[PDB]
Write a protein that holds these residues in place. Sequence first.
Motif, PDB file in Angstrom:
ATOM      1  N   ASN A 115     -97.365  24.265  55.072  1.00 36.19           N
ATOM      2  CA  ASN A 115     -96.393  24.013  56.129  1.00 36.19           C
ATOM      3  C   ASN A 115     -96.790  22.905  57.096  1.00 36.19           C
ATOM      4  N   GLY A 123     -93.992  31.532  56.031  1.00 35.55           N
ATOM      5  CA  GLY A 123     -92.638  31.029  55.903  1.00 35.55           C
ATOM      6  C   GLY A 123     -92.101  30.357  57.150  1.00 35.55           C
ATOM      7  N   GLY A 124     -92.965  29.662  57.882  1.00 37.39           N
ATOM      8  CA  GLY A 124     -92.561  29.024  59.121  1.00 37.39           C
ATOM      9  C   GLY A 124     -92.287  27.539  58.987  1.00 37.39           C
ATOM     10  N   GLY A 125     -92.283  27.044  57.755  1.00 31.33           N
ATOM     11  CA  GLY A 125     -92.048  25.634  57.508  1.00 31.33           C
ATOM     12  C   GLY A 125     -90.719  25.334  56.839  1.00 31.33           C
ATOM     13  N   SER A 126     -90.624  24.144  56.255  1.00 33.20           N
ATOM     14  CA  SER A 126     -89.398  23.682  55.613  1.00 33.20           C
ATOM     15  C   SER A 126     -89.130  24.403  54.300  1.00 33.20           C
ATOM     16  N   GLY A 127     -90.201  24.776  53.607  1.00 30.06           N
ATOM     17  CA  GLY A 127     -90.093  25.398  52.302  1.00 30.06           C
ATOM     18  C   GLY A 127     -89.377  26.734  52.323  1.00 30.06           C
ATOM     19  N   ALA A 128     -89.520  27.464  53.423  1.00 27.49           N
ATOM     20  CA  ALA A 128     -88.934  28.795  53.527  1.00 27.49           C
ATOM     21  C   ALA A 128     -87.416  28.732  53.610  1.00 27.49           C
ATOM     22  N   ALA A 129     -86.898  27.654  54.189  1.00 27.17           N
ATOM     23  CA  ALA A 129     -85.457  27.501  54.348  1.00 27.17           C
ATOM     24  C   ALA A 129     -84.779  27.172  53.020  1.00 27.17           C
ATOM     25  N   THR A 130     -85.551  26.637  52.079  1.00 23.66           N
ATOM     26  CA  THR A 130     -84.993  26.167  50.817  1.00 23.66           C
ATOM     27  C   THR A 130     -85.527  26.933  49.608  1.00 23.66           C
TER      28      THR A 130
ATOM     29  N   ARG B 107     -94.502  29.106  44.318  1.00 23.32           N
ATOM     30  CA  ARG B 107     -93.073  29.060  44.606  1.00 23.32           C
ATOM     31  C   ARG B 107     -92.299  28.128  43.681  1.00 23.32           C
ATOM     32  N   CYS B 111     -88.829  20.907  48.223  1.00 29.03           N
ATOM     33  CA  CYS B 111     -90.163  20.467  48.612  1.00 29.03           C
ATOM     34  C   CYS B 111     -90.674  21.116  49.900  1.00 29.03           C
ATOM     35  N   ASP B 113     -93.425  21.229  53.250  1.00 30.78           N
ATOM     36  CA  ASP B 113     -93.888  20.248  54.231  1.00 30.78           C
ATOM     37  C   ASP B 113     -95.065  19.445  53.685  1.00 30.78           C
TER      38      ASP B 113
ATOM     39  N   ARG G  40     -89.902  35.191  59.463  1.00 34.17           N
ATOM     40  CA  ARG G  40     -90.713  34.278  58.665  1.00 34.17           C
ATOM     41  C   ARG G  40     -91.554  33.332  59.531  1.00 34.17           C
ATOM     42  N   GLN G  41     -91.173  33.176  60.796  1.00 37.71           N
ATOM     43  CA  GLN G  41     -91.913  32.320  61.725  1.00 37.71           C
ATOM     44  C   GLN G  41     -92.980  33.093  62.497  1.00 37.71           C
TER      45      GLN G  41
END
Lengths: 235, 314, 235, 243, 210, 256, 224
Positions: A115, A123-130, B107, B111, B113, G40-41
Amino acid sequence: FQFPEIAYPGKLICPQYGTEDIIFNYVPGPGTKLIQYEHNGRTLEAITATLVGTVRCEEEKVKNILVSVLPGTNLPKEGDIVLTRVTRLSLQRANVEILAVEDKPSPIDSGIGSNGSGIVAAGGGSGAATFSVSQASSDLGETFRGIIRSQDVRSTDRDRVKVIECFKPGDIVRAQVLSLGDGTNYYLTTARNDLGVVFARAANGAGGLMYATDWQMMTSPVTGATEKRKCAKPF
Amino acid sequence: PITFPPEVLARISPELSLQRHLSLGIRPCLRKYEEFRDVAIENNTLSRYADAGNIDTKNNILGSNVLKSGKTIVITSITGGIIEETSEDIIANYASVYPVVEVERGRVGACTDEEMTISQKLHDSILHSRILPKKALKVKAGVRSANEDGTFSVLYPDKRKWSYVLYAKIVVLSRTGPVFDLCWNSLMYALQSVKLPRAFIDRETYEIICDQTKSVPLMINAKNIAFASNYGIVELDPECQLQNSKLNTVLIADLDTEAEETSIHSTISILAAPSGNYKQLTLMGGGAKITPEMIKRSLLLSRVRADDLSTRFN
Amino acid sequence: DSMSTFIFPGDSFPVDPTTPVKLGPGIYCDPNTQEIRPVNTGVLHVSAKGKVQTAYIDYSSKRYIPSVNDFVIGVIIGTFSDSYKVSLQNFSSSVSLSYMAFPNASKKNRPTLQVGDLVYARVCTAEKELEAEIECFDSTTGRDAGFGILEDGMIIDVNLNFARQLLFNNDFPLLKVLAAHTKFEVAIGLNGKIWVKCEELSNTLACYRTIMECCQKNDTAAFKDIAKRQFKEIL
Amino acid sequence: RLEIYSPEGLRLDGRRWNELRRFESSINTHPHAADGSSYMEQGNNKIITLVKGPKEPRLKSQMDTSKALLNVSVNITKFSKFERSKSSHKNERRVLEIQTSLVRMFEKNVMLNIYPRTVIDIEIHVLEQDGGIMGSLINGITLALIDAGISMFDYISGISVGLYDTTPLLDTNSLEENAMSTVTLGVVGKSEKLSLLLVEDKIPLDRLENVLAIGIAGAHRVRDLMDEELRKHAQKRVSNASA
Amino acid sequence: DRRRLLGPAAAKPMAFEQELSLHTGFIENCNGSALVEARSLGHQTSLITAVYGPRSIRGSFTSQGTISIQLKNGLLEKYNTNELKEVSSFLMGIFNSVVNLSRYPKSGIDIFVYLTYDKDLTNSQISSLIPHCITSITLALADAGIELVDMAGAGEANGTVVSFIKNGEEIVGFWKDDGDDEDLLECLDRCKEQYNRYRDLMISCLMNQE
Amino acid sequence: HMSLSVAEKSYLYDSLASTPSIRPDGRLPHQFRPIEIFTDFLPSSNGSSRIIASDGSECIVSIKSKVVDHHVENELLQVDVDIAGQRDDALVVETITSLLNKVLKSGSGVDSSKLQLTKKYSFKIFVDVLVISSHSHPISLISFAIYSALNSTYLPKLILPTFHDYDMVKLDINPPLVFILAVVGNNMLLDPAANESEVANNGLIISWSNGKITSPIRSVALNDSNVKSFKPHLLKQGLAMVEKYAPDVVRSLENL
Amino acid sequence: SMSVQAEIGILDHVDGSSEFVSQDTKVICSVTGPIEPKARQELPTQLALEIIVRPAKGVATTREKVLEDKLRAVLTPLITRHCYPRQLCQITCQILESGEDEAEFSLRELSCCINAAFLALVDAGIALNSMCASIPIAIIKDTSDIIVDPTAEQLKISLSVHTLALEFVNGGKVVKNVLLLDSNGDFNEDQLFSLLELGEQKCQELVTNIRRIIQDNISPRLVV
Ligand code: NA
Ligand code: NA
Ligand code: NA
């Protein structure tokens, strides 16, 4: 005949029973399964290794015997000892995340560095959203989640247990699995001498590491201050 | 006496594991402070021009590299395309590649980060280190003239403009730590192996098409080719020190093994050229105080690492 | 001491080392270095003495953080088995309001509050590990302590400094200049919420407008004028 | 360019300015696939509408303690037009706008509050398209929702009206929708009140009201048609069920 | 693409019997891993598998394990996505027959197969590639400590892939996609011989290595 | 249907594995469930079909055409599958799509020559499938709908190509059929019901064309709970069963 | 020589907000927190950060992702995160004007993002460990001079570009640590350390100026 000692998947260890005198009943333990194979147009019921490793047939209380296979020469199950991290706290329960099951880290990859450069949750980054729920089980650093209810903290005095005096967020707690629970949480317990806080930091994870001094108390070496936990007995 | 395997200890208390190992003069990755992981390279094995005698027709890979460091593997492949152009050492006259980094972890989906930032930083660093001049990506179009009447031959010079566009796919297996350095070095070797296919032509416009066999060297500025290094700065905590039967800080090279990645927040990363110049420097003081001494030792180690990585092959 | 001084995070703390000092908001005791360090930008405030002086930093904030003995205005957003889910501020973590936490309340006699109701309560518990808890009664005696439902009024969002100034500072003229024009009921919530109700809708609206405009303006002396222009009932 | 409106007052398909296309509807056409269902033909528009619910929410999110959740899925098949579309339409912004429009239309008509902690999924398949498809979607939804036994305050009739120069043309087909601006109307019951009012191309303000006038009227007729079907389907299936 | 550097849009892409090596446990950030390389005359392949699991699943409680299989194109974009997903589904069936799913309630096992290298000098190759996929997945599952009722094997002949267990007595997989018309029995025999050899090699690899 | 209890599964399996097999609705192992088909209802398309099964499974197929250069488009037949409640990304949808594309490949799925107009141009056939409802593997359902749609498909007649304005020629071709079988113990079942598919040991997808057992042939898990291995003689049984009970499905589908 | 424009508390529906302007680089930042994070955060023992950077032209890309990454690297040790366990701080930066040729450089934008984010964090009332200041620095092709706060023109002919974000304590007199140093181009060690000395001085200047700017509009908000 003698049971083979090395084992691989699909390998048959022994029939369902055996007489040598009394009639040993073979119970398929961890790493084995009772499969009914077909040979010569006829049926054979056999214990089959489902893992790679040394087979063991040990004896516990005409008399049946436990046949299992141990790797060398995982998944949380009821009775398994898991090492967890306290994530949430409430008057009723303690939410934890399973970090290891029987000296085995779960998951194998925690997702560090995924992240970015700061301090970010799995799951606090960009990957978790997608994340594709359709094509995968769970995200990168996703862990089995668990719950230690206030009742399941102690063996006695279960009625009036203060979880705030037992655990703190960030604490590493050694627990045992009571039940499979639901899809979200396993149900865990610390109601044993070897179960409870095995790691902790002063000021709720902010300070330095504290060591266990007494059954219900740890202390910080640099400050001298004492904090109240439910300590798992070392040694 | 309760005991945790190094793996699960790294999971449970990364800081404690790191400190404890450092108290013995070692690291949770079983190397000492300034010991890099060795690297092994298989260069230009995936390219279509891998075998000059029998060139693979189906293959479209212009360049190739397979790097291995510790237990981490990086596979880099360079493909290409052509864009129709429209209408010094300054940055305006330089180009870059367009990399897509795919770090193989559990996963599946878009992509992370990590992948995005590594890709972008690869692009940007290629641009700023000035390894690839725009001029070198210029296509000299030959023309396909018809044999007498009855078939076709192509003539190349020993009328619009065009430019080459390089793409990089970088996959990372068995990641154990930060992988940007590996990706950069792998991409460097890969870029060195790239061969640009020759191209020819026949409100209406005709398509340009690449020659099947002929190829010219991708001339990059070898002077400006740098290599990547990373370092952690750790502050020793007196309580976590082993007996081994007042504050100190140590410098660590080539981070790995999670315990280091999770615990260390003061980091330095360098792109250093064998010549002596530096192409990139990143200082992040998230934890311990970054002192000038650490910076200088880091530059030194980066340069010896660069000489090493540039010399060890050929 | 008595002289309040502007201070930035990271600045050297200027109070007397030998004198014992209880630390309020703005001042942080580092868990590892045991150093006393300011972490908020604003005005440093040292109370006279007594038995120990209080050192705190008054800083501009809009986001409320629950602390015990605070008078807050929440809105019921959920109903549970033995408690209400309450919101003290949008996007903030919710707060629990026990069903037992009412005057003349038993398991047979339950409170009659619905989702969307305004509640005026006291923060009784604000542990850093647990969800905050509020109450609508005197915890000691169990009778009404001026807390409970707020009906048919209008709520006003306001910064924390303004609200604290409104509840504690009696030299603050806003209430006085409001009383000069109409009769009104007011509830002050340190969470940055001001409840106002007049007999006539017009007057309550006037109060709303003038309170918000007064909130946006830093100058205190202007209030009267504003109130005037606002109670002149322009559109 | 061609006689969209001849001096004789006829159109290309042979209709007059104030006449609806052929409008036929069928109810309970998919009893094994949904709680409510409707197959609808308006001109050459052929649409299948399926209403699933009220039912248990798929997620234990998307659950509302006070009212039902209403979802609408519009599937414009690739073979709805003359020329097959190589691209799916499912995630196009046009389709999302249509979906949210229909949802926000029937949020105010369907008594969601009497179905709390449930989900009502509307699944629509446009088999054939020939202009004025929005009103068609509306009508299909109304029919299917009524077939499901799901309570609502009234009918909602959808219709489209084009504006050729000075004269408005009722219920426009595909050819008329091109080379002309169209207004789509979602009218509540027999009232003058509009659930939906959609204008996506430029229209002279001073002539807009007139366009609405016939539109409403047309919609009323549409209502009378849908009604006329339901009653019959009711009268048939309440008499045969007896003895 | 907002999440990738694809460069300029104006640009357009440039147009212009067998030996086995088996290894396991070389990938450190997953539970299981397998490297399978095959070399026949004028034909060389090599692929890698990684088993992540048993992991947690999003959704309701599941009474048994849930297996996912993901085929990733290596180097050349050699195959169609639909065909890759079809083969994935096939393999899912096979290892749903092989893996002891009862042991893993509320749990997911994700398997990744990277098709790194597939250059055959000979001048629908999916069929010949499937048995090596199965080999690698069985190896990686055994390496991950994932329980298997048997060692899933397979063979390919005349476009006919057949996957066996239990010494070739029974069938867990059958794939037939054109590849000419011949009688079933000899394809069965050839694929069974391939299966038995692959099985021996796999157990051997599991005895020298694990 | 789906999500049966262990008791239900045991009962159903015991009935379906006994000799002879007892199917929940008393069907013979080779007996199909009542379906009905409608054609020629979509005027805009060159062909059209709708198939309804007794259990509620409903499918719709549209046949459209477009002129293409063979040289630029080697594939003259494309199958696009859309299942309701399933995203186009879904594994099963792409699996079915791939499979159907292979059954209908212009190579040898159907006779490509029947599509040819000129040595440079031909009709590409776009087969659009819309599965409205399905409670079991819809591959046979879809296959049958496609068969009916193709056997009632009309194309514009040739006279750069120009075409007759009002007259159209019936597309003559022998469309293939795909059959699905349930392997339960030592018994093979045709047209498996949902409950039958929930306990089936395995499954067999068997293609069929001009009166011959053709490819693709697959083994397919009809579930994930009871997927077991099977003996080859069962596969032979399935093949024999199809080629024995296929011409009657063909004559039933082709009689209009 | 170096003069900046800065404003505080300009947005109504956030906890804190700032506007930072240096030369032609103009960046507005907002902060909301501590608020409830999504599951998730959430972090057990400390504050979680959601960081967003929007470009002046076009739509967010991997460029802005890198910007977010470096901004995170700066703001993480800045914030006293352990004061807000299981809470979220929402930090969003909207680049209004790049003040530099976007395709080749982004250091001006980064520096202004750091400054604005710091200012907004101050305005919000979030616990900070210390003060902070960031400047862009360039080394030119022919002159080989070290220009602090370089113009877009100077950047076009730059041989190297640099982002220097320093952490300050004790009235802005002491350098606690270097939060970020992002150096790209061709340079050597001597140049580096000269750049570091000059950079530190100029950053101290900036800290002083920022302190004054902060007190100027925070002081009237508070009571004696
Ligand atoms: Na109506
Ligand atoms: Na009319
Ligand atoms: Na599962």
